[PDB]
Amino acid sequence: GAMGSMERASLIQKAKLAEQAERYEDMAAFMKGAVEKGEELSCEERNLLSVAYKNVVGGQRAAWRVLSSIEQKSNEEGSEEKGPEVREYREKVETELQGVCDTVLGLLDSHLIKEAGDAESRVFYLKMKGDYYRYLAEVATGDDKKRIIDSARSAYQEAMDISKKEMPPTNPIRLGLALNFSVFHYEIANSPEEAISLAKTTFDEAMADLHTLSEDSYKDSTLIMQLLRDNLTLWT
């Protein structure tokens, strides 16, 4: 790996610099390098890893959607034949997207998840695993679409089981996991009722625990709760 010669602390420092400069590809490479040093990650370091790859794959997903829409329009009746170029370029972006997902899932499997014993770290990583299988599912169309969906579901479910046992209902990681699992149900699994039910129960149980929080923790929890409400409004 190209980052094998750089100190762990220097990689973390440069990831923070890359974030400030909005250089998310660099940020992701630095954090990949830091993970490959083999030490566990702190909370702050997990956040850097998450931000970097979310930004990279976010750009790819937005691009893929534009191209897929153009491709779908070309394959209607009345549409003029423009040759293989739209499909080719959509496939190019899709392959790069799948490569980023595979890289992240590879880091989780080798060996972040197996060393993660605390609830905060284990739930975060299993949520991430769910998320990146979900992004793979967004572009999947073949024999493995079903298996990819089940891989996402399985990761989210294991995360949910731990979070409900080990974390308060207002914990931001627990809340963010439930948000993303509800999105999985609505957008991927064709289960809008499961999505709505999860969003509602999550919201109500968090609401009832807000009284236990400080001002700062309250602000953190309520921000995510608003996103659950935004989805419920969109869905009902």
Partner: peptide
């Protein structure tokens, strides 16, 4: 429009 998932903080 698409559902909202967790943002970057």
């Amino acid at each position: 429009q698409r559902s909202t998932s967790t943002p970057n903080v």
